[model samples]
Target chain A: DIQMTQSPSSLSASVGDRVTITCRASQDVNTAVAWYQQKPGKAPKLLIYSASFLYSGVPSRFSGSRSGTDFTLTISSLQPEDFATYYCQQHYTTPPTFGQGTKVEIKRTVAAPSVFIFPPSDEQLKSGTASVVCLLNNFYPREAKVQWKVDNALQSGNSQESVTEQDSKDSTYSLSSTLTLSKADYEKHKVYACEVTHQGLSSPVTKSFNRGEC
Target chain B: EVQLVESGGGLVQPGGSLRLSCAASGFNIKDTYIHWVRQAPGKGLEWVARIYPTNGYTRYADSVKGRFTISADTSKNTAYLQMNSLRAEDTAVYYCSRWYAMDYWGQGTLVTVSSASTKGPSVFPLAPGTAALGCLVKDYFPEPVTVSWNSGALTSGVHTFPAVLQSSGLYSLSSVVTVPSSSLGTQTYICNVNHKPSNTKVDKKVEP
Candidate 1:
């Protein structure tokens, strides 16, 4: 059995970007090599065979070539559907072997959510109790730990429910949380905060709803 | 709820033949393709053979292309692997699992060839976002081994998995001690495994 080596092991790319992955075999396998693309939770699909020949029914955008004992699989223009793990195999001998797969993943461009604090509804305010809604819009990776803090100290009994969803077209996520408290507790310029602390951020960011604003 | 239960693994004499079995539950054996993959000692995974029970189509790796066969009994929902002329190199932890796409695994079967053995622990680094460290005590025999860690007082954090009996009638186990992500790389920890029957107490360390 011959050994096959795949390089980069993993890489990140965006839609429309050109990507190239390489494989090397210990000996000359000629055109006996094959390339495959495997998506998460799906069976692997053969992309190229006989080294450089693209397999039938596969997109022409996917191509493979060989130089000496090294092989290459190039995506001329990566499509959104092209993010997957690619593998190379050599059947030159009776004991065929496959290379360690090279994973092509989405390049995460972190986008901070645009936050807004909607003060409790006016009708609810008159009811001696209100709910403050903190909304997060257009965040990538949907990474936010929701909690409320009073003057930088952990405030208890105010954490509430969050509803999250992602926009399929833009691949961006959004979520909102509600904080409810008695009107008396929200009095006198007490600082009520909606902290969207996250590891994706370099520092803590918060949106505060001050009672004096009304 | 796909579950796989495998036959017991035991030692095979060098140059002998062996058969192993894996039965699937909660899913029809013919509905999912099954493959045999093995890890030799401390090495990485290697593909051996694959069988799609629905069609009876099968393929084998070069090493055993001529001497191996993997089959499924639809009536019993079981998959089987048989090999001829087994050698020391064929001794490994073999698993009959779902092939390629989204997967399932069986309790791995450890095969030992010949009578020779090595009993010690290997401290392995964990994948990021997984753990700080892991230790595998491989190729050991005589069960009921004692495994502990250098993480004292916080002794509860030192986890020791039960010893698994190998096909050779030997035993292996895993012990792990973890440090918080914040404290990683500032210290070293040791994994101790004892074999009282052999009077051998082996320990290994990991230095970040």
Candidate 2:
């Protein structure tokens, strides 16, 4: 039996761009190949059968073609919902074989910034050590430029920042950064700024924190 | 409105037995073709076996042909797979789906095979100083593994038994190496095991 091999294992593209994935068989599989799409936590959906025949209800943008042992699945214009894993199965031989899947990922745009600052507790203020937690939620692309300033001067304090887990329910990402400072310094200037720079934003968004404010 | 549900033990011993059940609902199982599929951690899916309950038609993947028996009970709206002489490689998540459309798939059942403890490479001093070296690598989950002995250009008698599957669903393997007493102290023996699916390897030295 012929074995199917897929190329470029994964690809990233923007919406509306044309995308093509190819599979090659060990021998002449002719047109007895089918294409399928599988998303995380969902059963696979057949897209094309017999190389070129689209399955019922499949989008017109999805198409397939074959020549000898090589086959191709193309999306004329990629859609947001098209980001998924694709596989090719050959039925030319008994005990059909499937190609290792290819994953399509989206080149997502930046999401508008939503920032929050958690103020120090009473115990922390008395202890002289306090943390001002800054959360940048509802963001996209994971990587965000963050800066901390105390009274317009770059502050070098202990900080913790990380991207939140991808929400399986919505497939969105968020980032959070925590900065620690001395309560004495906050009382001295009574002003601290959390600045965020994201690709989607034309100018950095800066939120300020006051010594006496929550 | 058709649904498939898989139920089976979470653990099985190597060289033991396993029976997995896939029950259907809101559908006439007698007229539908059911197939069993499995996926090991970090591996692609595998079509293990299938059955047509009404006509008794059955098929099995070559790799699992002799090791598994696929059957079904129409009256119960259920399909079954019984595997004998199980191995560590048998650990996987099994799913059931209809053959005609494969539109519906049952939730998977995870089966784990535990590992046997480390033992042996114990040497026995025989007559005239000749020695017999044996090691037992017991209770390892899964199978289709390679066990071997090594040390410099060494020529010795070695044999590996069909790994015995324990009742706990783990596998036990035994290999023996015989060498002349003169070379016993100078020659070193090593037992190596390789499991492909999980990309795991074990190397143990058999000491005299």
Candidate 3:
């Protein structure tokens, strides 16, 4: 690809904050370009491209604009889940190149006690049981959240928890739940899911699996 | 009908290198200049560089100038591009493209990079005597390429065949290159042609 200029290798914002960046193509060639978001080792997800056309199924918060050789990508509100890296690329020529990414870190200005979890105690299934925690790992004028949800349904109660500053403010959590169900629930194969809800970036990301009971 | 003909696949490992070519066919290989593009996995097409086969003039994206080279075989109705020092990221689909509005593109050929060495197309062996190298390409509207090896030197000619057909009922033109396989790979060779951005040359290297 031609020369692609991307700035701001890193960025920081509070929840509900706004951010943006610009990318410029080296010469007048094709007008097709796309923006992408990559988090760690996952595949780069398409964001917006071809000037202003958003990729189908993309969320509303991401948007793009173009003028001459210059183009821009903007995020309307800075949510906790919105933190990661963003890149822009031009499809005009051979050998495509990407702009350096921007990492958005959510600022902790809210006050909410961190939460945690301990492994469920059961006799039939002892191997799969593991302890999990959800709580802030620090203490400061900073505030964050770590809540638990079972099978997409929110779980509430007093749970063991702790908080501290691990890298950017991290929420350390601990929680536990037991499977006390009938054989019909097992034969039907219902997936019990667990989610870690936190502040900043976006919403909660869930991890679930089949109940290890027969 | 237009067609894009490219060189065969290349093999190179990390820190090693390879270069390949893509040639144009079925159309006025002269009037229509060709461009080279690359597409990385999951990424869109990338503009590598373009060349004028008739004059050997070329332009490249500034970033790739040092690493990529463009040349042509007007005799063979083809253009060539070579990229050196292949990286894993360089492993993508390389395409030969012709321009109109958006590129009238060819189905790209995937160049997979691996630690194992790959052998390209086999060149015919030559007799002990000196020989020549190069191709004689043809063009429509309507001159075609003709090649000959006189004595030990290579030569080319142009003949415009009539728009006639046999049992196939299809108009056709033909071109040739008659350079000795031996001399063609080692000695300097020339391809004579007349077309847009005219006066072309070919470089054929002997496989050791």
Candidate 4:
């Protein structure tokens, strides 16, 4: 059986962008290769088979071709859902092989979420109350959820939800959520955990602190 | 009305042997082919094994070829997967689909092999010069990876090669950074690799 190799394991692209993924068979497999697309958190779906034959119901935007040992899968225009992982398989011989997947990720002008925490002022501290602020900046899509936990317990302190604001220059978003807590109550357990959730993230971004010393 | 359904044990001991079943209905099983596909948690799908019942012909993924046996029974309209000496890395959700373009698919069945150790990637820097400096990352398990130069900060003039599946079933990644010759000495190229399955990141620094 010929070994299949795929290059550019991941790429950044936007909707309507054209992208091409290449697969190389260690030896000639003729046109017996097939292509599949696996969307994030979804099953793999066939796109092209027999090297160049687009599967039924597959959009015309997806195409494939073979040139000697090199086979290519091309997307004429990428759709929003097209940003996913793709694989190529060979059935020309026994023990068919698949290329390591190539992922087409949505390229954003913004960077990853950066988290910052703000402590309450001396005035609030002296009043036996404090306001803790969690700032999530530089995240795209302008949507995020913040969860506050005290001492590993889900706490619903007076806190604001995803208050989104866009950046003036880069068009990204900054989200801030404030949790007001009493100093006496905060001192009892002193552990604070903030989780930020976004649609683009696989898991929520979490920041934790032991405020006992602070 | 043709349909495929997969069934298998959800748990398998490491270095053990197990068999999985895929039963077909609403169509003549002997007339078409069936393929087995699997995906580890949060990872992309893998084409593992295939069987053509019409002629009793079969194909296996190179990684599973020697260790797996794929066969079918025309009378029962069922296909079987027998794997030997399983490893924890083999734990995954398996599905059976009609092989003619895989237009039909069965629900996936989860199988977990035992695990105790951790697996990390091995990175090596290729020789530098010619304005193109690159690095190779190999032997990472599970799927969905991001490999970049300078922690993805070197956005311009950077190219990353696709991750290839090695015969051992682990992934290998390569990336290149193109810069002016005069800039090579002034820069320390960092090849950063992130593997989602294990949530591990490895950064290797290369001196140009």
Using all chains and alpha carbons, the TM-scores for the candidates as numbered come to 0.41, 0.53, 0.34, 0.56
Say which prediction, candidate 2 or candidate 4, comes out ahead on lDDT: 4
Q: Which candidate, 3 or 4, has the higher DockQ?
A: 4
Weakest lDDT window of 10 consecutive positions for candidate 4 chain A: A161-170
Query: How far does residue B136 in candidate 1 sit from its true spot (Å)?
Result: 33
State each model's CA lDDT, in order: 0.67, 0.69, 0.50, 0.72
lDDT of 3 at B2: 59
The sequence of per-residue lDDT tens digits that candidate 1 reaches over residues A142-194 is 55887776555666656544333233245455565655567877664467788
Can you write out model 4's per-residue Cα lDDT over B109-205, one digit (the tens) per residue?
7776763333567655543433555555556754446777776678764545445545456655555555777887677788888875576888878
Of candidates 3 and 2, the better by DockQ: 2
- Runs of candidate 2 with Cα error greater than 4 angstroms are A110-214, B9-17, B24-33, B52-57, B75-77, B83-88, B100-104, B114-208
Highest DockQ model number: 4
After best superposition, candidate 3 residue A54: deviation in angstroms? Answer: 22
Pairs of residues clashing in candidate 4:
A7-B162, A8-B161, A8-B162, A9-B162, A95-B60
List ranges where model 3 is wrong by over 4 Å: A1-214, B5-7, B42-44, B100-102, B114-208
True contacts kept of 2: 0.06
Off by over 4 Å in 4: A111-214, B15-18, B42-46, B54-67, B115-208
Looking at candidate 1 chain A, the ten consecutive residues that score lowest on lDDT are: A160-169
Error of 3 at A87 (Å): 15
Clashes of each: 6, 18, 49, 5
lDDT of 4 by residue, A128-165 (tens): 75656566656776557788887787766467534332
